[PDB]
Design a protein around this ligand. Structure first.
Ligand SMILES: [Zn+2]
Length: 258
């Protein structure tokens, strides 16, 4: 498989190797704020990251993953629309070539500079590989980024990127606290969807926070210095690694807030 985000291997081609690309619950989507309905039955969302154990950072040629030890319930997501316990496995980002694009979800068609995905799996399925085969297998916590003030809790991430410039490179990345990437509010929209990259599995409950985090222009600039290619190949800057919004179809987006 040779999918990516260029003119020749990008989102509009993915459906050929991954036919679920055109399925019934694909992500990302546009969140119409005037159609999404406050759902008083959602419980409060619970983000328990106090015991999180980050291990490593990886450039996989599509994005970078900060990886976590998920061999126990150390960092978990519960509540909101979720039944049971979802364990944090990794986080990553999608971003643009300019500040006016980069996010995958959009809010009333507005694109943010980037989007953070904190990826969790449902413990009830025992491992991640099994969970991605289940309609309620994953829970991804989506956070928009906008350019403004710098986010201090992002800077360690920013600073390790020199060392994972190219595809395949990894660095040790211990004692990173993902709580520093959260906004103040946990108000959210939620809907059933998919992974936003191949294999585009329809296994995700999306929880997208309403309040974006601010990062600096200098911070986001350093994301754009990364490379899609591997070491000693011609340089393709890692930019615009985002899938555009997909048809909503027979789905409702529910809001946690009035
Ligand atoms: Zn993502």
């Amino acid at each position: 498989h040779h999918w990516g985000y260029g003119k020749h291997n990008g989102p509009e081609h993915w459906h050929k190797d991954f036919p679920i690309a055109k399925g019934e619950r694909q992500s990302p989507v546009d969140i119409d704020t005037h159609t999404a309905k406050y759902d008083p039955s959602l419980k409060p969302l619970s983000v328990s990251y106090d015991q999180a154990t980050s291990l490593r950072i990886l450039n996989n040629g599509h994005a970078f993953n900060v990886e976590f030890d998920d061999s126990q319930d150390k960092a978990v997501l519960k509540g909101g629309p979720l039944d049971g316990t979802y364990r944090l496995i990794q986080f990553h980002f999608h971003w643009g070539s300019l500040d006016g694009q980069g996010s995958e979800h959009t809010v009333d068609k507005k694109k943010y500079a980037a989007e953070l995905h904190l990826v969790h799996w449902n413990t009830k399925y025992g491992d991640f590989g099994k969970a991605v085969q289940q309609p309620d297998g994953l829970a991804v916590l989506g956070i928009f980024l906008k350019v403004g003030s710098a986010k201090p809790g992002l800077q360690k991430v920013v600073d390790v990127l020199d060392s994972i410039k190219t595809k395949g490179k990894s660095a040790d990345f211990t004692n990173f606290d993902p709580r520093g990437l959260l906004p103040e509010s946990l108000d959210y929209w939620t809907y059933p969807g998919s992974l936003t990259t191949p294999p585009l599995l329809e296994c995700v409950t999306w929880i997208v926070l309403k309040e974006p985090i601010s990062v600096s222009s200098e911070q986001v600039l350093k994301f754009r210095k990364l490379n899609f290619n591997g070491e000693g190949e011609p340089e393709e800057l890692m930019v615009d690694n985002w899938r555009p919004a997909q048809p909503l179809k027979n789905r409702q987006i529910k809001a946690s807030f009035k």
